Design a protein around this nucleic acid. Structure first.
Lengths: 322, 322, 322, 322
DNA sequence: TATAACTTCGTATAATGTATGCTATACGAAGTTAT
DNA sequence: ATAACTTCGTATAGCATACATTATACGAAGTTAT
DNA sequence: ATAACTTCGTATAATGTATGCTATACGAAGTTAT
DNA sequence: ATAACTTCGTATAGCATACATTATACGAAGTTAT
């Protein structure tokens, strides 16, 4: 108990050991679990196997995804392991229900989702509609879509790009140095080159926005109702705003969302990563090259994006079709 | 003892964590073992090593297969291990007798049997005979055989396909989503692509049966004697019936089975999985593609499948006849 | 001590859990280990980590191969695990010393060996050289070499073939049913077909020997100095005699071996298995088909046989030469 | 405490179970750690979690690489684990600080670097420049570059090749037997095949060096200023000198290195390995074939190797521009 | 009024991926047996 | 005197089996909309 | 003396296996400069 | 009075890291046969 107290003090002292996103999820899960425990007269810490099991059944009955349930369990595991206590996962009761819950939800037809693809056909279409808008907002947004599709960078990585990360190649293209990599060994590399077409789009945004007046300015910034951009070296466009661009672009072409509350009814942050992976597959680019283009180390993530493409139909279709 | 009862209770409480088939065989083996124990004045639980040893030798003396005897031992091991007790196989008497029985039976001529292959040449012949039929039953059966051969799915997996699990590639080939196999349980699941010609077979079945009136209908259903399909979202076509389709199709080409009482005299549920594996092997399909096709993650299983490749038409005879 | 005794008595009682070749090696290792222990004033049972370590270093200094050393350790491990005692391998000392031994022997240039290949060119040469012989011996020996090369059966498997295992195909070829498979799931299949040419070699042997006079007769039998064959249904030709055939055949062509004492200076029991794999690989037979042909489940055994063939030289050679 | 000294003595006694480099670095880190402890009034062994925590923060403050700090922690961990003591990383204070340091450094822009690629285009250019030289040094150096690119072997593995390790395919291509790499120690080892071109470069070196006078000579040896090679069976050409060949070859083509003190301004020992991996990936060589070429057993390392594929000529730019 | 076309069920046996270990051949030498 | 084995012990190469499931095989008997 | 190494120390990257954090999604509430 | 954000919390998709080694990177100092 003094041991657990000490262990948790260590966690606070070195809290930068974990992402702020990890902490947010931990806190969210602990609130959920503690609220459920107070309601059901259970002790929330240390978590007992039988109680954790009932809670997971609750999450299932609520309609949460299997991955959501795993997250809740994962956070409980982490809190306990770092406290020096036995993990909920290491119990018979919890291993058994998780097995049961996964099988039941799979058989009930639960599907993992993924971003609606934003592909070359969509990019050309948006390009042909918005190319000659000289509204600042439209100019920024097109440059952003170009970079997203061209580089397969995640929204948080795009939001962090500074003017000084960009140089010019011998061949006329912009080259974006990756200032902060995703991991120590950067599978996606240290640089992303833009095509000559996307280079033009970004050049347009830079000259229109004034961001290059200070090399430390983030590439992308706020554009207010009066078509004036507000460059900043201290404040990034939020990843939320970047998702808004994808959604607005989709609304431009396809109108209002279907309202069914479902996810991925419009393009989102991951849409151009999915779309690019698909276009490379269509063109016959090797799996390893596709994986490097997006900084993937696992084939299965990529497979999920491209597995409904005719080029990926497998040997039996090939055998049967001659 | 209270622990034992609690462990067993918890297993039964989350019984859906296990296959129906696992439970069915547990109960089947327990009955056999309990009946033998009553007759031989032994205690059925907890099971004593010397008694289990006598029981396994009794099973060998009954002329049962090695894989049958291992099933009985395996179910006994699971009952004990999941009670939190030592397995019968944790003792020398039982683990040595099991090895001894396997060795003696193999030395005496025993080998595991395999389903008769249903290969491309059989699928093509059946299609040439049946494709012109207007009978609902023939249209169903041909679509089923097409899916079985094209996908290599177990008959239980095919029986679970619902109309909503079907999508299309950009080239218009059918894609089947499968979330649960014997080895995979996942909300990401797998996509099984159908050739253009098998897609057409399934399209014909769909139009004639009316299964797509509800996306929750199982793709396959019973077809009564008046030729009318009876679609259902609650009732699968039994795997016994799917075995029946293979058997009836074998009869169509080859007439009645011989008298011997051996298994695998006609095509059965495993036939097109083995046939497709053999065809891929003979075509020189790469091992990764073979494994992708059958959904295997380990390479030793490919050898299980192709173990009975025809020797007379095989490599060495062909090399020598030079 | 009562528990060790009981455990060992269980082992005696179910002797047949292990191959006789396994017992012979356990007994051999125990002699060697116990004699070294007596010499060095050590207790041989239970074996202690420090003593096992010193013994392993003795084996190394003797010049025994790494596989041989592993064998002595594995037999020691077996005896202790089945006695219910801690295994020599589970100690820091023995674990550390095996790593050191492997590394030192490998750096000293110790190489694992394999049978001298008996390939199609050798088989053709032998047939050409011997086909005018009318001696029962030579006729038997040619039929043996033909079966060995054509079927890739191991010598013990060949020694066990009975006359009743042989049937005729509609093509005129002999088909040898495998009476006793290597394992329960026979990756080599249940049958080996002979080419028309090897069928003829075998037909000649059957007619000069008289073996077919009783269907339970082993196919191969001894032939005494008067050129008279002695068929038997109860006595096999020894696997040692079958190795003698390969050796004598090599000696005919190449003369007497070096007196160096090295292994594989002439053909031996595994030579035609090695040769046939190489001939299939030269002919472009796929690796899975080569494996099925010899009943191999692990690729790397086969790869050791064919690794020096130009077809197996890899991607870098292909890139460079193109 | 006696247990601890025994455990440590056992490790030292079987020194040879570990790489000489593991020992070198254990000693390097212990010196650094013990020197810091002396200056900071801490006890060096057994290490206190709080003291190790301070030391790691001290390394971070010095501007050392994340992988450097991991190495120090790693050697301290191994010293304690192999003593039979808890590792520093078994405490939160150490395991959390290590995560924190990694995350902070990466967030500040740190990423692991990679050798500059020595690819086919570089090999062809060097070969064009150097082919005609009759200096023993250049002949040696070109044979070395050829082997390094063709085989992807580590420089230490190339330095260990003895003349006796070389055989021939039927088509006359050299094959190099390698028994030991960073991940494999085997008396079966691997055979690394050379192209006909690279075979010729090696033959030329063998002819002019006289290394083949003794099969035990290492293939590569020093060449003194009078252009005469000094073959040896006991002394390897150093890996330092092999790095110097890459460095001098780079300088030949690009001139002298920057004075910036950064690593990988010129080719180094890992360059042909990364270069060959990239060439295979761009050529569309199958993953299993890339794995076979580099002697890798796991797929994630391919991604480590190809992480810095050139973006400007990469798949996305090509897709967008054509 | 029967029957096609199922479904249910029992015992019997095969198929999966991961983890760990026996089981065969090699061969010089000695022993055997019918010429 | 000897060919042509068999038996033996140990050295070393080559595969092998357990485990904990989850599945199919198939005859037979029971069911339900024609 | 010098080419062409070798030795040595610390600094940092590369492997295969086992396990776990870390990002995006998005409706809604809150903020700010037009 | 509002466009166009930012902040927030929870749901869910996507990757991520530790471990226990074994390797290379490279400046600089020391070495030997010319």
């Amino acid at each position: 108990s003094d041991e657990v107290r000490k262990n948790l003090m260590d966690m606070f002292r070195d809290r930068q050991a974990f992402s702020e996103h990890t902490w947010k999820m931990l806190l969210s899960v602990c609130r959920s679990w503690a609220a459920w425990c107070k309601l059901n007269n259970r002790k929330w810490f240390p978590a007992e196997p039988e109680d954790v099991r009932d809670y997971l059944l609750y999450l299932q009955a609520r309609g949460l995804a299997v991955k959501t349930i795993q997250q809740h369990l994962g956070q409980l595991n982490m809190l306990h392991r770092r406290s020096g206590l036995p993990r909920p996962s290491d119990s018979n009761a919890v291993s058994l229900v998780m097995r049961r819950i996964r099988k039941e939800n799979v058989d009930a037809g639960e599907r993992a989702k993924q971003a609606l693809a934003f592909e070359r056909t969509d990019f050309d279409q948006v390009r042909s509609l918005m190319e000659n808008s000289d509204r600042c907002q439209d100019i920024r947004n097109l440059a952003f879509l170009g970079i997203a599709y061209n580089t397969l960078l995640r929204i948080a990585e795009i939001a962090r790009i500074r003017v000084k990360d960009i140089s010019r190649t011998d061949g006329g293209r912009m080259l974006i140095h990756i200032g902060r990599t995703k991991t120590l060994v950067s599978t996606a590399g240290v640089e992303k080159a833009l095509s000559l077409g996307v280079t033009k789009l970004v050049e347009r945004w830079i000259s229109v926005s004034g961001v290059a007046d200070d090399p430390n300015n983030y590439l992308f910034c706020r554009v207010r109702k009066n078509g004036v951009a507000a460059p900043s070296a201290t404040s990034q466009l939020s990843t939320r705003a970047l998702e808004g661009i994808f959604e607005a672009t989709h609304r431009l072409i396809y109108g209002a969302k279907d309202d069914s509350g479902q996810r991925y009814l419009a393009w989102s942050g991951h849409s151009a990563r999915v779309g690019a992976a698909r276009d490379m597959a269509r063109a016959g680019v090797s799996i390893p090259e596709i994986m490097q283009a997006g900084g993937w180390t696992n084939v299965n993530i990529v497979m999920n994006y491209i597995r409904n493409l005719d080029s990926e139909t497998g040997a039996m279709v090939r055998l049967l079709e001659d």
